[PDB]
Design an enzyme around this catalytic site. Sequence first.
Site, PDB file in Angstrom:
ATOM      1  N   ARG A 181      -1.042  -9.913   4.364  1.00 46.86           N
ATOM      2  CA  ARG A 181      -0.650  -9.600   3.003  1.00 46.86           C
ATOM      3  C   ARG A 181       0.848  -9.249   2.906  1.00 46.86           C
ATOM      4  NH1 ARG A 181      -2.844  -5.999  -1.433  1.00 46.86           N
ATOM      5  NH2 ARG A 181      -1.203  -7.370  -2.322  1.00 46.86           N
TER       6      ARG A 181
ATOM      7  N   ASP B 224      -3.769  -0.809   2.909  1.00 49.00           N
ATOM      8  CA  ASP B 224      -2.358  -0.425   2.782  1.00 49.00           C
ATOM      9  C   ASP B 224      -1.975   0.611   3.858  1.00 49.00           C
ATOM     10  OD1 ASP B 224      -2.048  -1.987   0.466  1.00 49.00           O
ATOM     11  OD2 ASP B 224      -2.520  -0.400  -0.856  1.00 49.00           O
TER      12      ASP B 224
ATOM     13  N   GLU C 137       7.039  -1.246  -7.839  1.00 43.81           N
ATOM     14  CA  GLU C 137       7.816  -2.275  -7.161  1.00 43.81           C
ATOM     15  C   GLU C 137       8.783  -2.949  -8.135  1.00 43.81           C
ATOM     16  OE1 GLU C 137       4.276  -4.193  -6.072  1.00 43.81           O
ATOM     17  OE2 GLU C 137       4.146  -3.422  -4.028  1.00 43.81           O
TER      18      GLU C 137
ATOM     19  N   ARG D 208       7.615  -3.832 -11.921  1.00 42.69           N
ATOM     20  CA  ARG D 208       6.205  -3.725 -12.121  1.00 42.69           C
ATOM     21  C   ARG D 208       6.006  -2.450 -12.918  1.00 42.69           C
ATOM     22  NH1 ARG D 208       1.792  -3.591  -7.055  1.00 42.69           N
ATOM     23  NH2 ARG D 208       0.268  -2.084  -7.918  1.00 42.69           N
TER      24      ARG D 208
ATOM     25  N   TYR E  91       0.511 -11.009  -4.652  1.00 40.53           N
ATOM     26  CA  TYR E  91       1.947 -10.852  -4.613  1.00 40.53           C
ATOM     27  C   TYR E  91       2.553 -12.205  -4.383  1.00 40.53           C
ATOM     28  CZ  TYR E  91       1.885  -5.740  -4.164  1.00 40.53           C
ATOM     29  OH  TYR E  91       1.764  -4.420  -4.365  1.00 40.53           O
TER      30      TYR E  91
END
Length: 380
Positions: free
Chosen positions: A41, A66, A233, A249, A343
Amino acid sequence: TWPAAVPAPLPDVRADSSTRMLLGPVVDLAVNEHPEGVFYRIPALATASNGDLLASYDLRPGSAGDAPNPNSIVQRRSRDNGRTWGPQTVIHAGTPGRRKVGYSDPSYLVDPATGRILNFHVKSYDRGFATSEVGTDPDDRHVLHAEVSTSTDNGHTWTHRDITREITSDPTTRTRFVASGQGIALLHGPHAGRLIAQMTVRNSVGQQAQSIYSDDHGITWHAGNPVGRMMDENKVVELSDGTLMLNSRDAARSGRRKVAYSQDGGLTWGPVKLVDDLIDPTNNAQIIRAYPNARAGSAKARILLFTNARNATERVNGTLSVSCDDGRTWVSHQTYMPGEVGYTTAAVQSDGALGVLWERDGIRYSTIPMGWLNSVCPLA
């Protein structure tokens, strides 16, 4: 051992015989469960000073977790503009177990004045973005730390350091991460030479955007003043006059990107507003100059490219958006990948075409030849 990188200009979009926007072959850079229990990712894409094309992302062990999942930053390299790719190399490897370390969320920043390349990412121990505590000690296991990896040989070898302390001047800043994708070197106006990337932080004010920058070509980093609320972000792009633009974002989930302007190279930003023209599901995205070298006052200098998932709620339909006017308006949106994209990022390749990355069961790469651009933003 590899040759030292030599200064060289960033690439500009070049014209192609293409008449419309058409994705090239899809290349599967990394496939989830190849090998078993490994997930991939968070894409970053850059053109190194020798023209090599470089793709960076997380290797995530066990699941796609994450930070503080103990991740690793990895890379693959193309020497023929996306056609073929070398095998994976490690930028920085995490370690599992009680004293786990994680390296996660990569961004590139290429300096054309020296040929050096930076890879920013977090360094995690026990704590993620949300649960990180105030403190800047390098060994603090409750702190989400900021690392920079530096390469002087076009991305073959890296050395590592924690930049957490020098970019934390507000002691109530309890967490930070450089937004994954790519930062920039400034080429125009009074701050030409400055290297810059955008962070998201939490401090006593709220969840803000914050520039970090270097005027010594990447030896030391300093943080500008933070801006906005419900920021996440965000990416910085250098506009035709050297005015900077941040595109963000929106952690408040308006369904839109957010935008702010800086007149001093990222030290200070003004009001944050919605960009009504840019539908976004609260998700990462990349904005880049199509012709970074082009001078103030030319038509080429005002052209911005943007990739995101153009949807109000779901991370689907990876879309290339075009602005002819320094980002004041978006005259064109075209989806290059229907369905799940997660993303996405984009970068100009050395052959002048656009390279894109997105997330679908791992990391996928393709190329958009760019001849069709003149018919959307004329050059004369």
